[PDB]
Design a protein around this ligand. Structure first.
Ligand SMILES: [Zn+2]
Ligand SMILES: [Zn+2]
Ligand SMILES: [Zn+2]
Ligand SMILES: [Zn+2]
Ligand SMILES: [Zn+2]
Length: 212
């Protein structure tokens, strides 16, 4: 497959197939990788970076897929910045929608909580990463820290787990009584019925599955 990118030399440019009519520079043995987000080609220098950290990262350190943003800046509609240290990752203005169990009702309660106190999702992530670093909050990708270079999707995933733990350590008296009144769902946070408006509103799903 023939490949011409932003850092490709000018002779590669002119050699490509013509369209149909009605400080790097990639070497001959230079490969290209495809940014997972924007779909465009960049020179694949990941193996070189392995013994030359002077090279900008070109992959998420969790999923291990490649991304251009840190290398030379990505651009696409919906791309907030697809690679960053976790603590600086741009999660987008809508990162709190369904952030709790993909459950809008629960998410909204969290939203009101933060609005009421003038807190942003950034403030909340900042507190959360501090709990994480102490071992007070936990992650599935258990080795992730605020300094991890990762992607939009991976950061978001871990963001939801931190957020859940944040919501969890809010005291009942700091929430409206309409919220606290609701009884726990027997099936807890993983309940499948909570994506139906009526049920989400009727039961509290910030809880664990009932056993005994
Ligand atoms: Zn190139
Ligand atoms: Zn990733
Ligand atoms: Zn890109
Ligand atoms: Zn991107
Ligand atoms: Zn339920």
């Amino acid at each position: 497959p023939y490949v011409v990118c932003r850092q490709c030399p000018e002779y590669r440019r002119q050699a490509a197939q013509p369209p149909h009519c009605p400080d790097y520079v990639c070497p001959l043995q230079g490969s290209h990788a495809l940014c997972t987000c924007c779909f465009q080609p960049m020179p694949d220098r990941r193996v070189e970076r392995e013994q030359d950290p002077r090279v900008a990262p070109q992959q998420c350190a969790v999923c291990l897929q490649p991304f251009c943003h840190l290398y030379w800046g990505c651009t696409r509609t919906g791309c907030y910045g697809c690679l960053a240290p976790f603590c600086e990752l741009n999660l987008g203005d809508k990162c709190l929608d369904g952030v709790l169990n993909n459950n809008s009702y629960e998410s909204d309660i969290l939203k009101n909580y933060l609005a009421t106190r003038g807190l942003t999702w950034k403030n909340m992530l900042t507190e959360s990463l501090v709990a994480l670093q102490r071992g007070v909050f936990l992650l599935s990708d258990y080795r992730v820290t605020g300094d991890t270079v990762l992607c939009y999707c991976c950061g978001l995933r871990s963001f939801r787990e931190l957020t859940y733990q944040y919501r969890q350590n809010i005291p009942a008296s700091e929430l409206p009584v309409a919220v606290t009144s609701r009884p726990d769902c027997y099936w807890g946070r993983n309940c499948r019925t909570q994506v139906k408006a009526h049920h989400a509103m009727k039961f509290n799903h910030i809880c664990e599955q009932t056993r005994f």
